């Protein structure tokens, strides 16, 4: 089976804005996770073809990854900070759905999620 197309990163029909919360999500939250030592499994969509995981997209129907989130922020895809925070949480939830306690990917996701929470708990004030 094929990979699905990656999630849309630009919608030409959506209005666009810059906010301090969106700046924080890209330049502080995403950036901090992007340069972490456990970021590499989460920097792009799971390639179930090359990795030979034919059941991944039978189990994961809302795939999400930091490469997609990064592009969404850079393309002003998100109007509300909540839309971006939901994508991060979907990415982590997918990991814990597909994988088991003691898996190396689970320990990596847990460390990244701890850091995500520390950064998102300092989300700046809304305009
Ligand atoms: C054995 O697994 C890999 C081996 C090499 C590479 S790779 O970085 O060398 N490379 C990626 C681009 O295609 C060429 C190979 C990646 C991965 N894997 C991931 O990235 C990844 N991420 C998640 C979220 C996941 C996974 C796979 C584990 C279970 C599902 C699962 O939850």
UniProtKB/Swiss-Prot annotation:
Tissues expressing this chain: Ubiquitously expressed.
Ranges where the Bromo domain occurs: 17-123
Domain of life of the organism encoding this protein: Eukaryota
Cell compartments where the protein resides: Nucleus; Chromosome
Coiled-coil stretches: none
Glycyl lysine isopeptide (Lys-Gly) (interchain with G-Cter in SUMO2), cross-linked positions: 58
Functional note: Chromatin reader protein that recognizes and binds acetylated histones and plays a key role in transmission of epigenetic memory across cell divisions and transcription regulation. Remains associated with acetylated chromatin throughout the entire cell cycle and provides epigenetic memory for postmitotic G1 gene transcription by preserving acetylated chromatin status and maintaining high-order chromatin structure. During interphase, plays a key role in regulating the transcription of signal-inducible genes by associating with the P-TEFb complex and recruiting it to promoters.
Disease entry from the Swiss-Prot or TrEMBL record: Cornelia de Lange syndrome 6: A form of Cornelia de Lange syndrome, a clinically heterogeneous developmental disorder associated with malformations affecting multiple systems. It is characterized by facial dysmorphisms, abnormal hands and feet, growth delay, cognitive retardation, hirsutism, gastroesophageal dysfunction and cardiac, ophthalmologic and genitourinary anomalies. CDLS6 inheritance is autosomal dominant. A chromosomal aberration involving BRD4 is found in a rare, aggressive, and lethal carcinoma arising in midline organs of young people. Translocation t(15;19)(q14;p13) with NUTM1 which produces a BRD4-NUTM1 fusion protein.
Subunit structure as annotated in this protein's UniProt entry: Interacts with p53/TP53; the interaction is direct. Interacts (via CTD region) with CDK9 and CCNT1, acting as an associated component of P-TEFb complex. Interacts with RELA (when acetylated at 'Lys-310'). Interacts (via NET domain) with NSD3, CHD4, BICRA and ATAD5. The interaction with BICRA bridges BRD4 to the GBAF complex. Interacts (via NET domain) with JMJD6 (via JmjC and N-terminal domains); the interaction is stronger in presence of ssRNA and recruits JMJD6 on distal enhancers. Interacts with NSD3. Interacts with NIPBL.
Family: Belongs to the BET family.
Domain notes: The NET domain mediates interaction with a number of chromatin proteins involved in transcription regulation (NSD3, JMJD6, CHD4, GLTSCR1 and ATAD5).
UniProt name for this protein: Bromodomain-containing protein 4
Parent sequence residues shown: 44 to 168 of 1362
